[PDB]
Amino acid sequence: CDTMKVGGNLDSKGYGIATPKGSSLGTPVNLAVLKLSEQGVLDKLKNKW
Amino acid sequence: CDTMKVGGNLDSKGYGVATPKGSALGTPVNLAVLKLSEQGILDKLKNK
Numbered sequence A: 001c002d003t004m005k006v007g008g009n010l011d012s013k014g015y016g017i018a019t020p021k022g023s024s025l026g027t028p029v030n031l032a033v034l035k036l037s038e039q040g041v042l043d044k045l046k047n048k049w
Numbered sequence B: 001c002d003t004m005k006v007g008g009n010l011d012s013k014g015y016g017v018a019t020p021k022g023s024a025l026g027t028p029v030n031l032a033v034l035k036l037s038e039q040g041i042l043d044k045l046k047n048k
Helices: A026-038 A041-048 B026-038 B041-047
Strands: none
Touching: A026 A041, B026 B041
């Protein structure tokens, strides 16, 4: 507990789940992320960890 | 000049460019946005 985060972010990026191009999993997986976000689950997960 | 933002952001969301389903522009538009972001153009534009 000897470090500290200071100042606002200098830029904006994002983490995403990846799949090979043309993968049959791509559509469903993207929809799942929108859903989990909207249900507030991704925020729960970040706070938890 | 009598208000101000305090604290960081409490959550994260984004503005995006939207295309109708089936648009031939979808891919090129997405790649353009990522390019402008990574080149620092969008930061500069916001600052402007």
